[PDB]
Symmetry: C2
Subunit: 611 residues, 2 copies
């Protein structure tokens, strides 16, 4: 139409011009780079003054072991907060979660009891109103879940067999395609969602999957709505993103706004930023080959961009705060990799992103993992190696396994869960089922002796001396049957509720209509379970019981292979264990039919050429 | 328990003591009465002073054509309001919706736009907060529906083919069994709901109907919760209803509290009070045959009871206040009838209830319909007749058709919808589909000649200067196909949403676990459609056309049989029409599988006995 023309200028025509197909875009006109870091540009006085200003707050957090500041009366949404800056006139890319830098907000939808816990712990008071609103009017995810939980699930939760269950707040391991905002503009994305909404009208009237169709429709309505609040939010910062980004600054700013909306409305742990570097590099490259921008100017926008990314915070409590234990924010950016066609996806921008670890120093948070492949440009390989040595801040993943695995070169990383083709997959974060604890309970009739609690079904402890691997596994297998039911039942409830009371509209609005859902399951204490199993069949494992007969400790006469030592008879037990569980799980009904998956253990065949 | 023990003092054993079976109770120990109104007792000075006090407010409403007063900042719930009285020292039975008599409240869950409309119309201002809460935090029924509605449905609503759709507030034609509160006490009902909740565990874990089981569980959790807030509410009025009512005053007060909770949390039109008179009469009879109470004292409690019932109000808008199309409150009480065993269910209380039309004068609101049977005691028959002549306030229904029809003697009336066996049935209020308009559109190619807009699928208007019954019906039948899909699709959406955003927890908490749901469909303009069809096949109907060849009127030449008057050649058309539609409808998928029903036209083969 009107806008498209002005801003699409120079871009090699392709499907991405007809349907939301970011992937085709990038592939159609991005510039693979084999050069080296020489072209790089250093920091800026603005960038440095800004970073130092922020650093103040960080130092304050470390020293305090608490948030700089957080709301106690405002319920965050995409548009609840006014614009907020570190230094208006100094920022090239703008946008914060609240009005003040590092000031954490209240995102009540996940659960109110958590917010109370935060207020309590960091010694402040929750505005009685906010509590009333999310107790009597708007039910929270947390509350909804616990209303449906079974006594047994609660019981498993207490013992630890099931752990890390996202039932108190954001489940989030969702990667919305934020590049869309930039590449298409809100208006185009909103019209698209209307076509999606309308495409469901036949099924609705025909009664084909009635209730699921009604749900998908309401969800899309909310997506639409969210996209609209996105413009409102951006507007508060003097920007109108209704149309597609024109220059490299808007491209970056748009993409970030899409993410800012996510970070203002949801509080999940692994809301990856996605695969952006290369995408944005087509906008930067363009403005360079035209004289509109300067390489140092570019670097500066990137520096301000990741700077914000370093600033995203979430109000937690001591336990869950990234400080003590607590999973960190996982704004992950996947870099480089190779396209299915063989060309590398490494771009100038790739170097630019890594460069931020120099310009603004080393930082873990804008968690940048490299999509490593044996065929990445050497200069790039070397640089990463250099950067890693100097900042020890980069992460890596084998692109040579994933690319061919998904048969897609546009996937992104999401922490502690399988990768996802951006905008095409939705992954329900399951937590972890502890197979180590499961094994012990199996041995002890379902009881947790170090707690004197009957967790699983009542059965007889393993009698006799010197544990017999065959018997132990027989017991362990029947117990894994039970555990599979508890675990999947929990996840079924958790995600039904999270979809109802905390639908990630702003992010789902940046996914296709029908996304592939999977129940990302996880396992805890696998190595410990494998070792214990090993010892049982390669040594004299004399159980050491007590008054009641419960295995309290274990004597091992002999030697056995340990986990992490590439020895098959253990790595085999580990593998066996995993598949046994997943096989058990996969026989059960899962909410919305998301297929159970796992990423704790991957198996494969790879040819290594020597000489 | 001790509670039950003393409370059931004298009551005949039965299944009603080991489970919630109000029906068995009543049947097991109630006293059929064949006597006459002589035992009746007149009003009380308290009752009269109270009524007059109230009458003030009524006169105020009539003269003002507006509510006495209504909240503008408080969101009503079961416990949001403090106790409220007319005269705290005079009242024998207590409880009001808000703090002040006839002061209407805000029940935001159904939809906020309606509340705004009320504030606007009766010239007052809605507290900006309440609006924010039910727009950004808690989504309303109304909003949810309109997010899913199709453009087509919208057209039907605007043209009128579909009318009275409950998408702006309470659907309500729900009869919660309020006698339970009295007969069992809250604690017993709460424990019972926890057995119901727990009975769903197996299905949940086994994945049998996963998502429906999760829903039923959350719904029961809410029922439980609601029963709990019921105590809290009653507590504010100095009462503890955790245990079963002991005397006749508590029985009445308990039952009413159950209803008060419904009227404080929901705003549907036909929330019948149920079948209470006879039930309560076993409590009154008991306290009489023991000297604890006096016949005049009894009458007084009843007078205060129905008095409250006369006071229940709901904030609406002009176009929906009782006067205009505005459906009235339908606190209906079903009286008398016969039990399956032949004994009459008419009791001394039956007369007592009718008596309130004398003691406090004639009133339409505590809509008392008599479950008439040829076998009711003559004295009673005469009295009703007398009362009707003097107050013209009684309603009647044929018990001889319903009793045998449901094969149940414990059903209750719900206005403009089929009867329901108390506590066992849930009826989704569908509105009315206008078959008259449907017929005209059929004749006119889908065009509404009045608003000049295509509503149904485009087709050619019937050709010719004279209409041919066979052709008209052929067109009418294909059009009814379309209408059936749109109507049922609308209802599907309406009730999915109403279950999500306005679940009648306090009432559903007084129903069994699994209730039979039906899509109570209705028809508008049937007589008009029948007449028109008649004329087409028994006369000469020539249509007067407009510039687009649409029939804007008709000239009839000759006489045609008219509806009402038993001429079967018109009434057969009406019947044919109804079943044609219902047959069409019943082929479609309905939400939660509620079976479509209708009560606009009943067909019955009746056997009489002469001599």
């Amino acid at each position: 139409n009107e806008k498209l023309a002005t801003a699409w200028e120079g871009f090699t025509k392709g499907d991405w011009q007809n349907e939301v197909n970011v992937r085709d875009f990038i592939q159609k006109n991005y510039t693979p780079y084999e050069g080296d870091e020489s072209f790089l540009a250093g920091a800026t006085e603005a960038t440095t003054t800004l970073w130092d200003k922020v650093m103040e707050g960080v130092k304050l957090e470390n020293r305090t072991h608490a948030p700089v500041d957080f709301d106690t009366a405002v319920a965050s949404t995409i548009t609840s907060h006014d614009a907020g800056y570190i230094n208006k006139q100094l920022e090239k890319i703008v946008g914060l979660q609240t009005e003040a830098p590092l000031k954490r907000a209240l995102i009540p939808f996940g659960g109110i009891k958590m917010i109370e816990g935060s207020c309590k712990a960091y010694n402040r008071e929750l505005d009685p109103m906010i509590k009333k609103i999310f107790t009597e009017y708007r039910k929270t995810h947390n509350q909804g879940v616990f209303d449906v939980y079974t006594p047994d699930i609660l019981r498993c939760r207490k013992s630890g067999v099931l752990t890390g269950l996202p039932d108190a707040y954001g489940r989030g391991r969702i990667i919305g395609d934020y590049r869309r905002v930039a590449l298409y503009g809100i208006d185009y994305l909103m019209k698209d969602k209307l076509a999606q909404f309308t495409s469901l009208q036949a099924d609705l009237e025909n009664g084909v999957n009635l209730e699921q169709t009604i749900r998908l429709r309401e969800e899309i309505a909310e997506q639409h709505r969210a996209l609209g609040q996105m413009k409102e939010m951006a507007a508060k910062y003097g920007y109108d993103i209704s149309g597609p980004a024109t220059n490299a600054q808007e491209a970056i700013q748009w993409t970030y706004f899409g993410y800012l909306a996510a970070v203002k409305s949801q509080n999940g742990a692994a809301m990856s930023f996605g695969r952006t570097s290369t995408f944005l590099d087509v906008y930067i490259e363009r403005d360079l080959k035209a004289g509109k921008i300067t390489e140092q100017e570019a670097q500066e926008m990137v520096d301000h961009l990741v700077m914000k990314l370093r600033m995203v915070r979430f109000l937690r409590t001591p336990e869950y705060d990234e400080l003590f234990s607590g999973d960190p924010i996982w704004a992950t950016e996947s870099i480089g990799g190779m396209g299915l066609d063989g060309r590398t996806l490494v771009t100038k921008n790739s170097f630019r992103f890594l460069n931020t670890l120099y310009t603004m120093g080393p930082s873990p948070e804008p968690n940048m993992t490299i999509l490593w492949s044996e065929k990445l440009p050497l200069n790039f390989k070397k640089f990463a190696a250099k950067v890693s040595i100097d900042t020890s801040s980069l992460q890596y993943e084998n692109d040579d396994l994933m690319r061919p695995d998904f048969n897609n070169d546009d996937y992104a990383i999401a922490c502690c869960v399988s990768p996802m083709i951006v905008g095409k997959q939705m992954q329900f974060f399951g937590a972890r089922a502890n197979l180590a604890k499961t094994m012990l309970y199996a041995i002890n009739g379902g009881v947790d002796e170090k707690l004197k609690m009957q967790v699983g079904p009542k059965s007889e402890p393993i009698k006799g001396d010197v544990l017999n691997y065959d018997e132990v596994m027989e017991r362990m297998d029947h117990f894994m049957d039970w555990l599979a039911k508890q675990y999947i039942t929990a996840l079924n409830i958790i995600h039904y509720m999270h979809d109802k009371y905390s639908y990630e509209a702003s992010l789902m609005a940046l996914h296709d209509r029908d996304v592939i859902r999977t129940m990302a399951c996880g396992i805890a204490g696998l190595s410990v379970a494998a070792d214990s199993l090993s010892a049982i069949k390669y040594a004299k494992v004399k159980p050491i019981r007590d008054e009641d007969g419960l295995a309290i400790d274990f004597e091992i006469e002999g030697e056995y292979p340990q986990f992490g030592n590439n020895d098959p008879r253990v790595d085999d037990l580990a593998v066996d264990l995993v598949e046994r569980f997943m096989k058990k799980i996969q026989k059960l009904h899962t909410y919305r039919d998301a297929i159970p998956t796992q990423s704790v253990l991957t198996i494969t065949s790879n040819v290594v050429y020597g000489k």
